[PDB]
Amino acid sequence: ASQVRQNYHEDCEASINKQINMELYASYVYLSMAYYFERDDVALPGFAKFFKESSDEEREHAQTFMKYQNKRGGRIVLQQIAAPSMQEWGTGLEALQAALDLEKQVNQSLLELHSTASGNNDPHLTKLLEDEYLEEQVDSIKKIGDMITKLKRAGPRRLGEYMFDKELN
Amino acid sequence: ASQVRQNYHEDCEASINKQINMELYASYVYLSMAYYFERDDVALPGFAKFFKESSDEEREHAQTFMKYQNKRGGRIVLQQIAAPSMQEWGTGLEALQAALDLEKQVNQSLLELHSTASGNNDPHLTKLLEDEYLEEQVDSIKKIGDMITKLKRAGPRRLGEYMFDKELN
Amino acid sequence: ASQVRQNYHEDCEASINKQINMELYASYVYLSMAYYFERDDVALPGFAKFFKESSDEEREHAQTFMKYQNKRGGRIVLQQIAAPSMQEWGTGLEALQAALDLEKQVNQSLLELHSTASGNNDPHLTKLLEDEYLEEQVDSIKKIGDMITKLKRAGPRRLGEYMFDKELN
Amino acid sequence: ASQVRQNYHEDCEASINKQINMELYASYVYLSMAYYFERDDVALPGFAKFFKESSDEEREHAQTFMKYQNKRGGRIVLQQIAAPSMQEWGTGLEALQAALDLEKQVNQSLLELHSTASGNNDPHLTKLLEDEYLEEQVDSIKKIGDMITKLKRAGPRRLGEYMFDKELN
Numbered sequence: 050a051s052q053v054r055q056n057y058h059e060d061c062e063a064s065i066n067k068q069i070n071m072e073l074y075a076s077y078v079y080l081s082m083a084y085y086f087e088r089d090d091v092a093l094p095g096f097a098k099f100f101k102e103s104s105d106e107e108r109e110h111a112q113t114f115m116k117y118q119n120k121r122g123g124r125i126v127l128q129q130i131a132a133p134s135m136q137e138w139g140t141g142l143e144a145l146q147a148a149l150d151l152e153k154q155v156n157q158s159l160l161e162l163h164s165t166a167s168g169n170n171d172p173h174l175t176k177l178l179e180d181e182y183l184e185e186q187v188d189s190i191k192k193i194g195d196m197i198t199k200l201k202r203a204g205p206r207r208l209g210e211y212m213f214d215k216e217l218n
Numbered sequence: 219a220s221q222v223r224q225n226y227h228e229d230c231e232a233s234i235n236k237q238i239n240m241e242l243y244a245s246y247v248y249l250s251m252a253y254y255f256e257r258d259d260v261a262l263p264g265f266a267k268f269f270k271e272s273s274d275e276e277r278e279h280a281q282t283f284m285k286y287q288n289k290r291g292g293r294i295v296l297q298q299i300a301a302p303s304m305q306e307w308g309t310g311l312e313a314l315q316a317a318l319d320l321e322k323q324v325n326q327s328l329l330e331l332h333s334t335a336s337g338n339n340d341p342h343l344t345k346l347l348e349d350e351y352l353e354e355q356v357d358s359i360k361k362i363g364d365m366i367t368k369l370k371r372a373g374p375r376r377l378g379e380y381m382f383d384k385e386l387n
Numbered sequence: 388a389s390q391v392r393q394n395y396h397e398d399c400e401a402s403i404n405k406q407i408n409m410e411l412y413a414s415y416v417y418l419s420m421a422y423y424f425e426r427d428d429v430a431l432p433g434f435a436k437f438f439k440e441s442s443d444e445e446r447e448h449a450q451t452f453m454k455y456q457n458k459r460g461g462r463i464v465l466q467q468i469a470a471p472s473m474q475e476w477g478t479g480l481e482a483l484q485a486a487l488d489l490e491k492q493v494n495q496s497l498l499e500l501h502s503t504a505s506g507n508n509d510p511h512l513t514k515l516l517e518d519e520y521l522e523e524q525v526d527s528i529k530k531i532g533d534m535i536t537k538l539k540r541a542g543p544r545r546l547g548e549y550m551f552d553k554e555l556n
Numbered sequence: 557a558s559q560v561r562q563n564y565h566e567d568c569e570a571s572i573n574k575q576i577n578m579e580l581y582a583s584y585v586y587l588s589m590a591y592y593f594e595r596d597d598v599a600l601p602g603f604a605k606f607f608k609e610s611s612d613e614e615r616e617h618a619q620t621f622m623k624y625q626n627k628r629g630g631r632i633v634l635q636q637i638a639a640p641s642m643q644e645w646g647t648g649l650e651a652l653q654a655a656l657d658l659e660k661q662v663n664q665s666l667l668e669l670h671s672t673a674s675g676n677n678d679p680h681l682t683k684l685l686e687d688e689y690l691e692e693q694v695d696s697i698k699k700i701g702d703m704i705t706k707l708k709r710a711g712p713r714r715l716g717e718y719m720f721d722k723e724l725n
C-alpha cells in the first residue's frame with residue numbers, strides 16, 4: 050500500500066472515484082446549460098452566468114475529491130464523462146428543475162458515501178463529507194428551490210422570466 | 219416603595235407590564251412572518267427582511283418599557299408570550315394587512331395607556347409615550363398603508379409582487 | 388413534501404421546533420435576569436450586560452434553527468413561550484447558578500436531538516449540532532462555571548460581588 | 557405687558573421665579589458637598605467630582621429657566637439663596653441620601669409647576685418642563701438610587717467606599 054495509507058477502506062476509495070466522475074458529469078451538464086442560455090435565440094445571460102458558476106463549482110468539488118484520494122493514499126481512476134442528458138434545455142424553469150433533480154441525485158450519492166464511510170469507521174472521510182460536500186449541497190438545493198418559486202411567481206415565461214434573469218446577472 | 223418612586227401610580231405600572239407583553243407578542247408575530255417569507259415555497263426576501271426588522275423594533279420597544287419600569291421604580295412582571303395567531307401568513311398583501319391591524323391594535327393600547335397616565339397626572343409617562351411610542355406607531359401605520367397601496371397597484375400577486383418585494387430588499 | 392426535502396425525518400423536524408421554543412424560553416429567562424440586575428435596588432450592571440448578551444445569543448440560536456428548518460424543507464411551528472420561572476433572581480451567584488442549570492438543560496436537549504439525528508442517519512443535522520450548538524454550549528457552561536468559582540472567591544456578596552460585577556462590565 | 561407676552565399667566569411667571577431660586581439653592585448645596593469631599597480629612601475625589609458636576613447642572617437648569625422667563629416676556633426676580641442646610645455632610649452614603657431627597661423635592665416642585673401650567677392651558681411651558689426638566693430629574697433620581705445601592709453593597713464605609721469613589725472619578 051501507499052506509505053501514507055491508514056484506516057482507508059478500498060470501498061471508500063472506489064466510491065470516491067465514483068463521486069469524482071459524477072461531479073465531473075454534473076459540471077459538464079451545467080456547462081451545456083450555460084452555453085445553451087447564450088444562444089442568440091435564448092439570450093438569458095443571468096441563467097448563463099448561474100450555470101457557468103455552477104459548472105465551475107462542480108469541477109472544483111471533483112478536484113477536491115481527487116486531492117483527497119491522494120491525501121489518503123488511494124489512487125485516482127478516471128472514467129469517461131457521459132454526454133449531457135440533453136443538448137437543449139428548454140425554458141429557464143425547466144433548466145432549474147433539471148438542476149434541482151441533479152443536485153438531489155448528487156446529494157443522494159454523497160449521503161450513500163457518508164454511510165459507507167461511517168460503516169467502515171472512517172471519521173476523517175465522514176468529516177470531509179459533512180464539511181466540504183453535504184453543507185454546500187443542501188445550500189444549493191435550497192437556493193435552486195427558492196429560484197424556482199421566485200421564477201414561478203415572476204413568470205415563469207415572458208416578462209417575468211426576462212426580469213428574473215436580471216436578478217441572476 | 220422603591221427609593222426612586224415618585225408620582226408613579228400602580229395602574230400605570232401594571233399597564234406598562236401589559237404593554238411589554240403586547241410588544242413581545244408583536245415581535246414574535248413578526249418573527250414568524252419573517253421566516254415564513256424565507257420558506258423555499260414562498261421566497262420573498264424583501265418581505266422577510268421587512269418583518270425581521272419589524273420584529274427587532276418591537277422587541278426594542280418592549281425593552282424600552284422594561285428600562286422605563288425600572289427608571290420609575292416599578293417592577294417588571296413578565297408573562298407568557300402567546301403563540302402567533304397563525305403559522306402561515308398567506309400572500310404578501312395578507313401579511314401586510316395583518317401587520318396593519320396589529321399595529322393599530324398596539325396603537326390603541328398605547329393611546330389607552332396615555333389616557334391612564336394623563337388621568338393620573340403623570341407627565342413623565344405621557345412624554346415617554348408621545349416621544350418614544352406614539353410617533354413611531356403612526357409612522358409605521360402610514361408606511362404599511364403606503365406599502366399596501368403600492369402592492370395593490372403593482373400586483374398584488376405574480377410579477378408585481380416579485381417586483382415590489384425587490385423594493386423592500 | 389417540499390421540493391427541497393431530502394433525508395429529513397419528521398421526528399427531527401419536530402424536535403427542531405422543540406429546540407426553537409426552548410431557546411426562545413432561555414432567551415426570555417436571560418432577558419428577565421438582565422433587567423432584574425438594572426433595578427435601582429440591585430444595580431449590578433456587569434451582570435445585567437452579561438445576561439443581555441446571553442439573551443441575544445439564545446435568540447440568535449433559535450433563529451439559526453428556524454433558518455435550518457426552512458433550509459431542509461421542514462415547517463416552523465411556533466408555540467407559546469412560557470413566562471420565566473422567576474420574576475426576581477436573587478443574588479448574582481444565584482442567577483449564575485440558575486443560568487448554569489438552564490445551560491445544562493439546553494445542552495441535554497441538544498444532545499438528545501443529536502442522538503435522534505444520528506439514529507435517523509442525518510449527517511447534515513449532526514454536523515449542524517456539533518458545529519453551531521454543542522461547542523458553544525460547552526463553552527458557555529465552562530465560562531459560567533469559572534464565573535461561579537471566581538465570584539465565590541471574591542465574595543459572593545458585598546465588596547467581592549461589587550468588584551466581580553466590574554469584571555463583567 | 558411685554559411685546560412678546562402671549563398666553564403666559566402670572567402664576568406661571570411667579571412659579572418660574574421660585575424654581576430658579578430652588579435650583580440655585582440646590583446648586584449651592586452640591587457645591588458645598590463638592591468641597592466637603594476635598595477636605596484633607598475626607599479626601600473622596602470621586603464624590604467631589606460627582607457633586608461639582610451636579611452643582612454645575614443645577615445652575616444650568618436655573619439659567620435655562622431665566623432664559624425661558626425672558627423668552628415668554630416674564631420678568632426675572634432673584635431672591636436670596638439660603639445657606640446650605642449643613643456645612644459638613646457626613647459619609648458618602650449620607651451625602652447621596654441627602655442628594656436623593658433634594659432631587660425628589662425639586663422633582664415635586666417641578667411637577668407642581670407642570671400642574672399649574674396645565675391648569676392654565678400653557679402647552680409651551682408643559683413641553684419645556686417635560687423635555688428640559690422632568691426627564692433629567694427622573695434620570696438623576698434613578699442614578700443616585702443606583703449609586704446608593706452600589707455603595708451599600710461595596711461598603712458603605714472603609715475599603716468599599718474607597719473603591720466606589722474610584723468608580724465616580
Ligand SMILES: [Cl-]
Binds near residue numbers: 050
Ligand atoms: Cl499505490
Ligand SMILES: [Cl-]
Binds near residue numbers: 054055056057058
Ligand atoms: Cl488502510
Ligand SMILES: [Cl-]
Binds near residue numbers: 060
Ligand atoms: Cl480495504
Ligand SMILES: [Cl-]
Binds near residue numbers: 056057058169
Ligand atoms: Cl478500513
Ligand SMILES: [Cl-]
Binds near residue numbers: 137138
Ligand atoms: Cl436535446
Ligand SMILES: [Cl-]
Binds near residue numbers: 142143205206
Ligand atoms: Cl416554463
Ligand SMILES: [Cl-]
Binds near residue numbers: 064161162163165
Ligand atoms: Cl458509497
Ligand SMILES: [Cl-]
Binds near residue numbers: 201205
Ligand atoms: Cl409555473
Ligand SMILES: [Cl-]
Binds near residue numbers: 206207210
Ligand atoms: Cl418567453
Ligand SMILES: [Cl-]
Ligand atoms: Cl403565453
Ligand SMILES: [Cl-]
Binds near residue numbers: 220
Ligand atoms: Cl420593590
Ligand SMILES: [Cl-]
Binds near residue numbers: 223226
Ligand atoms: Cl409614587
Ligand SMILES: [Cl-]
Binds near residue numbers: 226227228229
Ligand atoms: Cl398608586
Ligand SMILES: [Cl-]
Binds near residue numbers: 225226227338
Ligand atoms: Cl399617582
Ligand SMILES: [Cl-]
Binds near residue numbers: 304305307
Ligand atoms: Cl396557520
Ligand SMILES: [Cl-]
Binds near residue numbers: 310312374
Ligand atoms: Cl393577495
